Amino acid sequence: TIGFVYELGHDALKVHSRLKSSVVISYLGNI
Amino acid sequence: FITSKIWDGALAENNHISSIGNIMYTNYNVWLILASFILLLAMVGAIVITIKPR
Numbered sequence: 001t002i003g004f005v006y007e008l009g010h011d012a013l014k015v016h017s018r019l020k021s022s023v024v025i026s027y028l029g030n031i
Numbered sequence: 032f033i034t035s036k037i038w039d040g041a042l043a044e045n046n047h048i049s050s051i052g053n054i055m056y057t058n059y060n061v062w063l064i065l066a067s068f069i070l071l072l073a074m075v076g077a078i079v080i081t082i083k084p085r
């Protein structure tokens with residue numbers, strides 16, 4: 001069973017595995 | 032080759048798989064441990080040398 005949770009844990013069968021923007025602007029005003 | 036019947040030894044005869052089972056999990060259970068580990072190694076090792084992780 002432990003060897004079965006290893007392939008479950010790794011998707012060896014490759015059966016599984018089938019947005020906020022990082023750019024944030026700030027306003028400071030005039031020079 | 033000649034064969035004859037027996038009665039004391041035919042009281043509760045077992046099929047070969049029941050006879051293998053009567054001893055496979057008790058008296059010779061170390062053989063089951065090693066085999067469990069050989070199969071477990073053939074799982075981990077063959078998965079790790081073929082698949083791309085993630």
Ligand SMILES: CCCCCCCCCCCCO[C@@H]1O[C@H](CO)[C@@H](O[C@H]2O[C@H](CO)[C@@H](O)[C@H](O)[C@H]2O)[C@H](O)[C@H]1O
Pocket residue numbers: 001005008009010011016017084085
């Ligand atoms: C007594 C009977 C017990 C039966 C089994 C009991 C549960 C044990 C098995 C699950 C244990 C957790 O194992 C987990 O499996 C999931 C599903 O593949 C994996 O899932 C994660 O990785 C895989 C592979 O990149 C991705 O496809 C998936 O989208 C992601 O969520 C986790 O990496 C793993 O941590």
